[PDB]
Every structure is written in C-alpha cells, then in structure tokens.
Amino acid sequence: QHAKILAIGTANPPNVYHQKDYPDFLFRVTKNEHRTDLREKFDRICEKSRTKKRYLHLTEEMLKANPNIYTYGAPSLDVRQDICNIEVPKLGQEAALKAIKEWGQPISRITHLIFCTASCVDMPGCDFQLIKLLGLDPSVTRTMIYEAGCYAGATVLRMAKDFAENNKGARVLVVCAEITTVFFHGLTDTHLDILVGQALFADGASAVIVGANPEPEIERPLFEIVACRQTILPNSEHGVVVNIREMGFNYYLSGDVPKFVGGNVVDFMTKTFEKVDGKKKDWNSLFFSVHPGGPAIVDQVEEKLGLKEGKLRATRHVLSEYGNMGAPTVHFILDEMRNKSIEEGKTTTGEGLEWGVVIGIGPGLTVETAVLRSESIRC
Amino acid sequence: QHAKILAIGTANPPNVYHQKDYPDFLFRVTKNEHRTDLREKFDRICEKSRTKKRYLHLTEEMLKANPNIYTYGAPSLDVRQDICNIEVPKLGQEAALKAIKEWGQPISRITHLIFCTASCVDMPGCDFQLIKLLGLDPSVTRTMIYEAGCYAGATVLRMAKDFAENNKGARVLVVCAEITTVFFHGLTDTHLDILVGQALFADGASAVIVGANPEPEIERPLFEIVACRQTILPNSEHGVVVNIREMGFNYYLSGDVPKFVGGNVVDFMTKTFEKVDGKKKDWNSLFFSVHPGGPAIVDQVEEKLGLKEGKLRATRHVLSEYGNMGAPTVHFILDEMRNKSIEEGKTTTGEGLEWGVVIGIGPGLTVETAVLRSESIR
Numbered sequence: 001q002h003a004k005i006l007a008i009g010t011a012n013p014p015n016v017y018h019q020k021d022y023p024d025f026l027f028r029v030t031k032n033e034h035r036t037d038l039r040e041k042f043d044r045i046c047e048k049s050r051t052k053k054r055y056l057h058l059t060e061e062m063l064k065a066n067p068n069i070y071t072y073g074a075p076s077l078d079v080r081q082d083i084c085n086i087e088v089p090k091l092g093q094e095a096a097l098k099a100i101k102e103w104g105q106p107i108s109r110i111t112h113l114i115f116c117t118a119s120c121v122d123m124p125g126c127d128f129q130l131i132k133l134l135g136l137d138p139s140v141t142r143t144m145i146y147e148a149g150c151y152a153g154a155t156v157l158r159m160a161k162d163f164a165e166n167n168k169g170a171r172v173l174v175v176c177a178e179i180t181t182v183f184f185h186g187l188t189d190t191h192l193d194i195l196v197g198q199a200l201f202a203d204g205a206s207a208v209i210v211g212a213n214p215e216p217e218i219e220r221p222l223f224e225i226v227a228c229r230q231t232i233l234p235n236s237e238h239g240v241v242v243n244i245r246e247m248g249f250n251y252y253l254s255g256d257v258p259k260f261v262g263g264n265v266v267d268f269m270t271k272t273f274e275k276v277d278g279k280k281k282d283w284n285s286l287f288f289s290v291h292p293g294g295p296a297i298v299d300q301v302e303e304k305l306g307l308k309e310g311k312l313r314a315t316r317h318v319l320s321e322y323g324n325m326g327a328p329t330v331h332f333i334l335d336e337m338r339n340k341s342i343e344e345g346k347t348t349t350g351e352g353l354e355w356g357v358v359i360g361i362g363p364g365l366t367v368e369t370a371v372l373r374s375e376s377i378r379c
Numbered sequence: 380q381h382a383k384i385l386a387i388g389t390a391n392p393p394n395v396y397h398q399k400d401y402p403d404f405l406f407r408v409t410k411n412e413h414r415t416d417l418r419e420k421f422d423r424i425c426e427k428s429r430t431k432k433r434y435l436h437l438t439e440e441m442l443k444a445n446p447n448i449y450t451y452g453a454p455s456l457d458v459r460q461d462i463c464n465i466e467v468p469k470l471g472q473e474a475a476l477k478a479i480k481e482w483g484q485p486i487s488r489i490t491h492l493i494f495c496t497a498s499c500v501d502m503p504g505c506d507f508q509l510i511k512l513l514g515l516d517p518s519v520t521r522t523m524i525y526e527a528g529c530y531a532g533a534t535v536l537r538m539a540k541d542f543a544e545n546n547k548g549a550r551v552l553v554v555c556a557e558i559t560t561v562f563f564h565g566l567t568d569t570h571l572d573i574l575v576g577q578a579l580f581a582d583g584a585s586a587v588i589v590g591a592n593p594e595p596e597i598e599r600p601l602f603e604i605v606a607c608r609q610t611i612l613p614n615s616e617h618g619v620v621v622n623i624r625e626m627g628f629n630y631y632l633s634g635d636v637p638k639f640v641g642g643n644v645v646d647f648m649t650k651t652f653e654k655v656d657g658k659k660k661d662w663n664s665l666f667f668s669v670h671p672g673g674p675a676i677v678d679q680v681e682e683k684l685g686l687k688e689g690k691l692r693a694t695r696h697v698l699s700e701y702g703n704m705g706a707p708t709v710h711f712i713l714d715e716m717r718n719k720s721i722e723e724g725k726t727t728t729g730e731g732l733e734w735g736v737v738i739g740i741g742p743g744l745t746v747e748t749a750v751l752r753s754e755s756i757r
C-alpha cells in the first residue's frame with residue numbers, strides 16, 4: 001500500500017502583477033528608467049517568459065520604505081527576513097487550510113509535518129510557526145527543509161512517501177511556501193541573471209496531505225507516489241547558485257540550464273522508470289508535472305522526450321498564470337491537472353492516464369523525479 | 380528488521396581551547412580587557428560550565444583579519460559564510476571517512492545521505508559538497524537539514540530509520556557538522572546571552588551509517604533504532620532563538636531552559652517508551668545519550684528521572700572534553716559509550732544494558748527522543 005496524495009491546496013499573495021505591466025513597474029520603482037539598455041533586454045525576456053501574471057507579496061510601499069532592497073549589494077537581509085519569516089508561514093497556513101478541508105479529517109489526525117521554503121530561515125523555523133498557526137499537535141514529527149530550491153517539490157513527496165509508508169496510520173502535511181521578497185535585487189549589467197529572476201520568480205504556497213491506506217468514505221486519493229529518484233546532472237554545478245548574504249539571497253543562473261536538462265532528460269527518465277517497469281520510450285503515455293524553471297526548460301523536456309502538442313498544457317498553464325514559484329509549482333500543476341481532468345470528464349486525475357511523473361529541477365543541477373499513478377475521479 | 384546504527388565516526392578542528400585559558404583569550408582578542416565586570420561574569424560562567432576544553436576552527440588570526448566578527452552587530456555574515464560553507468563539509472568529510480572505514484563497505488554502497496548543520500546555509504548545499512568530496516554516487520537520495528539546532532542529533536536518526544526501513548537494502552550516511560565561527564559575537568552588557576554561548580559552544584562533526592538487515596559477518600550493528608518521538612515543550616518558545624542576520628547567527632538563551640527540560644522529561648520519556656512497551660519503565664534500567672546543551676540540562680534529566688550516580692557519565696565526559704557541539708554531540712556520546720563498554724568488558728554497547736535513549740533538545744523548545752537497543756560487542 002503506497003503513499004497517496006489525499007488533498008492539494010494552494011495559495012498566493014493578493015497583489016497581482018501582470019507581465020505586460022511589470023517592466024514599467026520594476027524600472028520605475030527601482031529608479032532605473034535611464035537604463036534603457038536594460039529595459040530593452042528585460043522587455044525581450046518578459047516577451048519570451050510565457051508568464052502572463054504573477055502574485056507577489058512585495059509592494060511598491062515596501063520598497064519605498066526599504067530602498068536598500070533595490071540598491072544592488074546593499075545590506076538588506078535583516079529587513080527581508082523580518083518580512084519573510086512571518087509571511088512564509090502565513091501563506092503556508094492558507095494553503096494548508098484548503099488542503100485540510102479537502103482531506104476532510106480533523107487536524108488532530110496529522111502526525112507529520114514537512115515544511116519547505118527557500119525564502120527564509122530562522123530558529124525555531126517555519127514548521128514551528130505553522131504548528132502554532134494551525135493548532136497542530138505539539139508532538140507532530142517535523143521535517144524542516146530550508147534552502148533546497150526548485151527540485152524540492154518532488155523531494156518533499158519522496159520524503160512524505162517514506163514517512164507515510166514506514167509509520168502505519170501516519171498522515172503527512174507537506175507545505176511548500178515561497179515569498180520572493182528575499183530574492184528581489186536591483187539592476188546592473190554586471191549581474192544580468194537578475195533580469196531573468198525578475199521576469200520569472202513568483203510567490204505561492206502549496207499544501208499536500210500524504211498517507212497510505214486511505215480511510216474508506218472519508219479519504220479519497222488523488223495520486224499514488226510509486227517511486228522516486230534524485231540525481232546530479234554532470235558538470236553543471238554553476239547552473240543555479242544561491243548565496244545567503246548580507247544583501248539578501250543572491251542568485252546566479254547559467255544560460256545553459258535548459259541545455260543541461262535537455263541533454264539529460266531521457267537518461268534521468270529512463271533511470272527513474274527502471275525502478276518501476278523499465279520503461280525506456282513512448283513518454284507520451286505518461287502525464288507530467290514539470291517544474292517550469294523557465295519556458296526553455298519546458299520546451300527542452302517536450303522536445304527531447306518527443307512529447308506531442310498539448311502534453312505539457314497543465315505545466316504551461318501554471319507557468320502562464322502564476323510564474324515560477326519554486327518548489328510549490330509542481331503541486332500547483334498537479335492540482336490544475338486534477339481540475340482540468342474533472343472539467344473534461346476524464347476517467348482519472350492524470351488527464352485520464354494511469355502513470356505520470358513529477359520532475360523537480362534545481363541547484364546541482366539536481367533533478368528529483370517522482371513516478372505517480374493517477375486515481376479515479378470520485379467524491 | 381529495524382534500522383541499525385552500523386558505524387560512528389567523529390572529527391574536530393585541530394585547535395584546542397582549554398577552558399582555563401579561554402576568558403583570557405576571549406577578552407584579549409576582542410579588545411575587552413577594560414570590561415572587568417563582564418570578565419567577572421564570564422569567569423563565573425566558565426567555572427560552572429563543566430567544560431574543560433573545546434575544539435574550534437576559529438583562530439586569533441582570523442579575528443585579526445576580520446574584526447567585524449568580534450565587533451558586536453557589525454555586518455559579518457558574508458565572511459562567516461565564506462568560512463563555514465567550506466569548513467563544515469570538510470569537517471563532515473573527516474567524520475564520514477571514519478564511519479565508512481568502520482562500516483567496511485564501499486562508498487558506492489551508500490544510497491542515502493543526510494547532512495545536518497546549523498552553522499551555514501548555501502545552494503547547492505553541504506550535502507552536494509560532501510558528495511563531491513567523498514565521491515558518493517551522484518544519484519544518492521539526499522536530505523539536507525539546515526538550521527534545525529540542538530535536537531537534530533536525534534532527528535537525523537529518526538529520518539535515517541524511515542529511509543532505511545522503507546527502502547530495501549538502503550544504506551544511509553548521516554553527517555552532522557558544526558563550525559561555530561558563525562555564532563561568535565563580541566561582548567555587550569545588553570546581550571549577556573553571548574557570555575553563555577562563548578563558554579559552551581564548540582565545533583565538531585559526527586557521521587553514522589544506518590541500515591536495516593545487516594549482512595551477517597560483513598556488517599555489524601552497534602545500536603538498533605526502535606522508535607522515535609518529537610515534541611514541543613509548552614510555553615517555551617523563548618527558550619532558544621537563533622536569527623540569521625547581517626551580523627551572523629545571533630542567538631538568545633533563556634535561563635529557564637533547564638527547568639523546562641526537567642519539567643517535561645518524565646512526560647516525554649514516558650510518551651516515547653509507550654511507543655514500544657505498555658509496561659512502566661525503570662529509568663535506571665536504560666543507557667542514555669543526553670544532549671548536554673549545558674551542565675544544568677544534564678542535571679535536570681538526572682534529577683527528575685531519579686538516575687543513580689554515574690548513569691550520565693558518558694554524557695558528562697563528552698561535555699567536559701568537547702563542549703556543546705550541537706547536533707553531533709549525542710553521537711559523540713554514543714561513541715564514547717561504545718568505547719567505554721569495550722574498555723570495561725561490558726556485554727553490550729550500551730553499558731551492558733539492553734534499552735537506551737537519545738535525547739535531543741533545541742529550539743521550540745523541541746525535544747526529539749530515539750529509543751535504542753544495544754548490541755553485542757563483536
């Protein structure tokens with residue numbers, strides 16, 4: 001009896017930033033309107049981003065009050081942490097309450113908590129703060145995953161699987177929450193990576209309830225977590241780097257990340273499915289939740305796996321409507337898949353298909369995959 | 380069946396700071412010799428520390444080169460991180476090679492890695508760096524535990540147990556490593572908590588190999604990880620606080636932490652052993668690895684569990700010879716227990732007893748317990 005996803009909830013900050021307006025906003029609020037050179041490059045990036053809108057906690061008023069946040073390299077970690085250490089658990093709480101509602105059980109049945117964020121760090125951590133906010137049992141068994149990055153949407157499912165399968169009756173609340181205030185940086189032609197993050201990064205939280213042996217008439221599985229694999233792509237340690245510094249969380253993004261993903265996806269998919277049935281081709285038989293680190297990563301997975309038009313629609317839909325929210329994004333994609341599957345009258349939560357995969361991609365470059373089975377659409 | 384500890388290794392930085400000399404060192408190198416009031420308080424704390432010496436990466440030359448590190452509140456996180464992001468994986472590598480030697484299997488047999496540190500944070504993380512240093516399989520399944528704090532020596536055993544028990548043949552390398560350079564702060568009469576940290580905190584790393592179903596005649600278990608429990612002690616959120624700031628990892632320590640531990644130990648011990656057995660436990664029938672966050676915490680466990688003289692000898696020995704190294708410390712204590720049991724000709728790795736417990740204590744206040752069984756000395 002494998003671990004099942006029993007519920008998914010999601011949440012975002014209330015402020016909507018449409019991409020058509022974000023260049024004007026960013027360059028105005030950071031006092032960079034003279035950098036017409038950088039505005040051209042940012043317009044081009046936004047045009048290619050395949051991101052139509054994003055939800056952000058950050059507001060213009062916060063920047064006016066804390067201009068060090070947009071002053072490249074200036075000390076600002078403390079004010080960023082003061083915000084994010086509060087806002088990340090709060091946004092997580094909202095998602096968790098939605099997941100718990102779907103699940104339909106009392107909060108007292110939660111035995112385990114996984115909290116994941118790359119947006120802040122504190123002791124006690126976000127997990128402790130969420131226990132207070134939700135009134136979880138003080139003896140919940142906790143895993144606090146700080147600063148893992150964009151593969152961790154798959155990683156937390158892998159951890160949840162083992163915790164749920166090895167501890168009979170366990171019910172695991174998994175919460176991934178990101179507030180990108182800590183990553184916001186001003187504009188300099190010495191660090192153009194920032195233009196890419198400014199176009200793509202976004203705020204959001206997911207919550208997933210994981211458990212084996214669903215209770216009949218109460219619990220309803222959405223997906224089954226079958227098998228998982230984590231690997232490091234060769235010769236790519238420069239792909240995604242984040243340093244936690246006095247200036248905030250500083251990041252570097254190699255232009256070659258999409259090529260590394262494309263050059264490795266057939267291998268890492270094949271090695272993942274060796275843990276199941278030895279599948280080695282015909283990837284269109286699967287449903288997919290691909291972490292949309294950027295649009296070129298999505299395009300590379302589609303091209304090198306030979307995916308048909310529309311196979312990655314749910315992934316592209318979330319990237320369009322929410323941007324890259326980090327680890328929660330693959331859970332938004334699973335939720336979107338489930339919702340569209342209901343809308344279309346599909347037989348399962350995975351677009352009618354039986355087997356699928358979650359692909360998380362982050363620093364290392366590290367790829368974690370989770371092979372899923374869908375479930376019938378019921379109650 | 381149950382996950383077993385198959386090996387334990389430990390490591391420390393090479394610089395030894397005898398406590399008798401540390402007040403003179405601290406006040407000289409931080410330019411605080413004029414604060415005789417603070418010196419008097421620090422002498423008193425050191426005298427009560429029950430810590431005879433500590434190993435530290437930090438040197439006087441480092442402080443001279445980076446005086447912001449001892450200038451209270453000055454921006455210094457970047458230099459601290461530049462040191463600790465390198466030094467934490469290196470020290471962990473030393474411990475891991477020792478554990479791997481004891482275990483006696485190829486590095487390529489390791490399927491899972493847990494790395495734990497509260498001394499730094501970076502992306503990719505320490506786990507990634509250790510994979511490079513050791514040549515671990517690039518597909519090892521990793522868990523990177525940043526900034527949990529002093530309960531995590533028990534937490535990582537709980538995590539390793541689930542990974543080892545749910546994945547047939549899995550072999551988990553667990554590495555905990557701490558370099559307290561990130562926590563070093565100068566002295567101000569507005570933040571006297573620093574005097575306690577300056578007296579007690581120390582550097583070290585542990586490595587443990589965990590697996591279920593040890594191979595007969597090839598692997599040999601030291602302890603069995605039977606059951607685990609994590610809990611928050613009521614009304615103690617202020618007990619231990621660490622904020623990751625421009626000035627480094629700043630910390631606050633409540634004077635009530637020992638009383639909180641003593642006020643809860645019977646309960647958290649009872650609730651933990653109820654996961655194993657319905658009979659009442661005799662606490663003196665156990666062997667103990669207690670996180671020595673300070674000497675008063677050890678005294679509180681001894682008192683409220685009614686432990687006989689000497690029951691906590693191994694714990695107190697590590698506190699005396701190494702100080703509070705954070706999460707690794709309870710693993711140093713298990714290693715010390717195993718070593719002393721060999722020396723004394725005991726029948727088991729747990730002082731000749733069958734059942735034991737690891738008690739980790741940290742922010743929340745959070746207590747994680749792991750129930751252990753000993754193994755025969757072979």
Ligand SMILES: CC(C)(COP(=O)(O)OP(=O)(O)OC[C@H]1O[C@@H](n2cnc3c(N)ncnc32)[C@H](O)[C@@H]1OP(=O)(O)O)[C@@H](O)C(=O)NCCC(=O)NCCNC(=O)CC1(c2ccccc2)OCCO1
Pocket residue numbers: 041044045048049118119149150178179180183192193196197201202240242251253254255256257258292293294295296297324325326
């Ligand atoms: C960018 C683009 C859309 C361009 O569109 P394209 O269609 O590809 O056009 P291109 O022909 O390639 O050139 C287009 C023009 O942009 C220039 N350009 C393109 N790339 C780069 C570059 N890397 N550096 C410099 N310049 C670049 C190029 O030089 C050219 O400039 P030009 O026009 O002036 O000539 C495409 O490439 C793409 O999807 N990239 C994948 C992005 C990627 O890695 N995401 C994963 C990373 N995740 C995190 O870090 C996670 C997180 C976090 C946390 C919490 C919440 C949210 C996140 O943050 C830190 C830690 O956690």
Ligand SMILES: CC(C)(COP(=O)(O)OP(=O)(O)OC[C@H]1O[C@@H](n2cnc3c(N)ncnc32)[C@H](O)[C@@H]1OP(=O)(O)O)[C@@H](O)C(=O)NCCC(=O)NCCNC(=O)CC(=O)c1ccccc1
Pocket residue numbers: 420423424427428497498528529557558559562571572575580581582619630632633634635636637672673674675676703704705706
């Ligand atoms: C601290 C001792 C030995 C004191 O000796 P004592 O108990 O025998 O007599 P005392 O009269 O109490 O002390 C003498 C004088 O110091 C004052 N005073 C005492 N306690 C104070 C406090 N807590 N605050 C503030 N003032 C305090 C007191 O007021 C008196 O003042 P005086 O009148 O002399 O001027 C003991 O209490 C004790 O074990 N406490 C438990 C310590 C504890 O919880 N550690 C948790 C560890 N946390 C971490 O995070 C670890 C970490 O990062 C790390 C990361 C990586 C690597 C390694 C580490």
